[PDB]
């Protein structure tokens, strides 16, 4: 069992790093950048109607 545990721990240590370092900042950058562009289209329209 002991040899079997050693083989599994390595797959498991890899995953804990993988999520934090890659995934979480990829989600952050995508969401915020699209949020910012999306609000811009809406704001300029108001200014053009007003003008």
């Amino acid at each position: 069992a002991f040899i079997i545990l050693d083989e599994v721990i390595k797959v498991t240590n890899r995953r804990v790093n993988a999520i934090e370092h890659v995934i979480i900042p990829r989600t952050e950058n995508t969401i915020a950048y699209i949020n910012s562009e999306l609000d811009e289209l809406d704001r300029e329209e108001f200014y053009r109607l007003k003008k």
């Binding site: 390595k10 240590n13 890899r14 370092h21 890659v22 811009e40 704001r43 300029e44 200014y47 053009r48």
Partner: protein
């Protein structure tokens, strides 16, 4: 005539139609104080002025207008170094007066004579990461991209002070034969900042070296936009008339851009992407066009603008625009700063596309450019490997990757780590750089030409 109304930085004058565009007018307050402005828009029997100074207290028939009948030009003299001036076309510091031998326009074409021949002379900062990886030339434009957790002022001053000691060592080498002049202009920064800068220049050398334009944050946005224009007139005269190389340090460039943003918000002018003007391209251009070698071809204006990024993003309009226009990019990193690296310059995205113009070969090595490309390439691989070291562990990474992780660590801690007054010659930097390359084997250094690798290792 008399003020009709005032809506923000815009002033509505009811007048008569004789005024010309950007003709100076002086507003006489009931206090008997005069403040200056220039007409931004003229129409029949009326004007819109933007006043440089102030933006409130402006009356109606108790106030009066008087015309100067000269559109704004800056009084330029060549005896400007050592002399204290204020960013308003005159000192309001009570510093030594400007004088005039020419008055030159800030529109962006007075008599403008620039590059039909690109920079070929190397100018060093004494800092390896700048000089080796990107290079600086007698017309080069390089933006310092900085942050709200980096100390922008300390790096700004660092680059300038160390480039003054190196630059006469380069004069002796015959990279130069003409004077060096500094033009330092601070526009709309804190008092704390302003004081600091002056103190820094004194320690290294003197303040006789530099000319100072000081503009205070409490003074308007309209003042702030004229502040670099004043710097440009100073530099163009020195290069043109007296064949001097002029170095301009323009802080803060972001300060200037926010100002533009304010005169479209309190104007009826519709702004472009992210609330920054549509005609933002032209405003920025004016500063950057007035660069390169100046006629006679011993004079020059070289630019180092200083940008502080507020969000620290590379999707913000200011860093993006600046980058397309400028001949290089120097990115300064918060993570290096934290770790204990000074200067804490990350070269991962620092790039020049006008890399050839930037390097020298008649007062620097020919090998300088060849080594730099290889270094950058090997740094980048070393970063790809760093992310992979966190994920995968050392439990599958390859023999080749291991060399690249070592290189990355040796590279930060030796090359980019320099004393506060320690200046490195460009030739000595090569020797340092060669130490960095030397741990990789002759099959990993395969991309480089065989001739260079067998010659210098």
């Amino acid at each position: 005539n008399t003020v009709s109304g005032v809506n923000g930085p815009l002033v509505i004058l009811e007048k008569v139609k004789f005024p010309r565009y950007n003709e100076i007018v002086n507003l006489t307050l009931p206090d008997g104080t005069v403040r200056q402005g220039q007409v931004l828009e003229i129409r029949g029997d009326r004007a819109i002025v933007q006043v440089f100074e102030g933006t409130s207290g402006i009356d109606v028939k108790k106030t009066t207008v008087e015309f100067t009948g000269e559109s704004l030009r800056i009084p330029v003299s060549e005896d400007m170094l050592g002399r204290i001036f204020d960013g308003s076309g005159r000192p309001i510091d009570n510093g030594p007066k400007v004088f005039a031998e020419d008055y030159l326009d800030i529109n962006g074409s007075p008599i403008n004579p620039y590059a039909r021949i690109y920079p070929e002379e190397m100018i060093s900062t004494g800092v390896s990461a700048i000089d080796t990886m990107n290079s600086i030339a007698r017309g080069q434009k390089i933006p310092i991209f900085s942050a709200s957790g980096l100390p922008h002022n300390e790096i700004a001053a660092q680059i300038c002070r160390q480039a003054g000691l190196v630059r006469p060592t380069k004069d002796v080498h015959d990279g130069h034969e003409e004077n060096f002049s500094i033009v330092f202009a601070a526009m709309g920064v804190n008092l704390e900042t302003a004081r600091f800068f002056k103190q820094d220049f004194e320690e290294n050398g003197s303040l006789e070296r530099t000319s100072l334009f000081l503009n205070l944050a409490n003074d308007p946005t309209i003042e702030r936009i004229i502040t670099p224009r004043l710097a440009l007139t100073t530099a163009e005269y020195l290069a043109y008339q007296t064949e001097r190389h002029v170095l301009t340090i323009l802080t803060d460039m972001s300060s200037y851009a926010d100002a533009l943003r304010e005169v479209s918000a309190a104007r009826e002018e519709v702004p472009g992407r992210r609330g920054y003007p549509g005609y933002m391209y032209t405003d920025l251009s004016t500063i950057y066009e007035r660069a390169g070698r100046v006629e006679g071809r011993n004079g020059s204006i070289t630019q180092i603008p200083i940008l502080t990024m507020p969000n620290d993003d590379i999707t913000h309009p200011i860093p993006d625009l600046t980058g397309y226009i400028t001949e290089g990019q120097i990115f300064v990193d918060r993570q290096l700063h934290n770790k204990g690296i000074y200067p804490p310059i990350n070269v991962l995205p620092s790039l020049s596309r006008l890399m050839k113009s930037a390097i020298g070969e008649g007062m620097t090595r020919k090998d300088h450019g060849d080594v730099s490309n290889q270094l950058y390439a090997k740094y980048a691989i070393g970063k790809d490997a760093a992310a992979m070291k966190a994920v995968v562990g050392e439990e599958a990474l390859s023999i080749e990757d291991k060399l690249s992780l070592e290189f990355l660590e040796k590279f930060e801690k030796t090359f980019i780590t320099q004393g506060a007054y320690e200046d490195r010659t460009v030739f000595e930097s090569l020797d340092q750089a060669w130490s960095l390359l030397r741990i990789y084997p002759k099959e990993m250094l395969n991309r480089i030409s065989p001739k260079i690798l067998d010659e210098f290792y």
